[PDB]
Amino acid sequence: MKFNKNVTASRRKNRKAHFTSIGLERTKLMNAPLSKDLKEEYGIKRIAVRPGDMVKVVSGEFKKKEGVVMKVNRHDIKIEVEGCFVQKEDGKKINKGIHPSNLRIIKLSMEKDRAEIINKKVEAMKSEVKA
Amino acid sequence: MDIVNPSLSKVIDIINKGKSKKQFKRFQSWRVKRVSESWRKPRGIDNRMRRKFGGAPDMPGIGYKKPNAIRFLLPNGYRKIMVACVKDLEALISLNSFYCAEIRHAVGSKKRIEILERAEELGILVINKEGKLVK
Amino acid sequence: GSIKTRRIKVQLVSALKKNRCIPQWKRACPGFKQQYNFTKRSWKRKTLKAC
């Protein structure tokens, strides 16, 4: 049960809040679980998927496959994974997008600011965990 | 399906050949497409059917009602009960002399198999037995 | 006619730049849902009221 009356439980309001999200709230939509080993290598339980990271598909047509993230579509919430595609009548191949939550991370791309992003989150935990 | 209630076997054909095939179509439903066939009583000041002139059609009424014993009886000599569960057949266990079962349309294939298996061992007649499960 | 005031001329200039169809590249954009520009006009069918 919910006892805070400032938070809404309306279906109409929850749905609008989802689809009209922007900025950091949009980034929260692209989160995926880490594998059991990585959850010992790092403190975090889940992270936003980025290009170059390595993922196992755990639901759908392409179940059991593994591959590298090629692109991240923020407007239509989908991820393109290397080697997951369909062939047209022409023989031409189109990558099919997968929803973030159907993936699981196997190796992290550590290019750019990723190491600082991870550090910032670990500290935020401990700050309140140790109190 | 060619089955009959054993208590009425030597009588069922007299009963069936005795049932009326009269229809009570709404007045002038033959004249304009916007009036459906479903019965409504005419209430006009001039109307020839309400006033019962010879040559107009007949109106419904209590005189046409069937004898209390024959009423509701299917052509195989049983009355019907609707079922949708295995636990429904359990009700018929005392009544199987006069009543038979008809599985509701929305019950799917996997479940129908379980209903029919139970019907065989309890000794209950099911009239939709073939149903969708012919394939 | 040939004689015009400055106020009348600016109204004509603005009414002439607005009178154009949707550019052909926009139709390819994923989010774009318009078919035809309903604000397009013809001199044979409407008056501007520039007077």
């Binding site: - | - | 106020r7 109204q11 009221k49 007077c51």
Partner: protein, 89 residues
Amino acid sequence: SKGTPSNGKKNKRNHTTCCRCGSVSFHKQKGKCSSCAYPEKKMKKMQNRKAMLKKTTGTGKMRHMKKERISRRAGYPGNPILKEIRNKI
């Protein structure tokens, strides 16, 4: 006759664009606008509630009024170079 043939003579134009309201309703001979009463200081009485709500605050852009509300929320902080003047006052 009073129908079609009299329509041919209708080539003069009594109203032009008003400089206060845009509405092509300034009567040149009377020296008055029929929408907004220019050049009188106050705006005209509008005929009914339906017609007046079409021209109320919030029907346009409200540029100044929106900024003022944001500044009030923030506590009227002013330009940060000049904090010392603010603090003294």
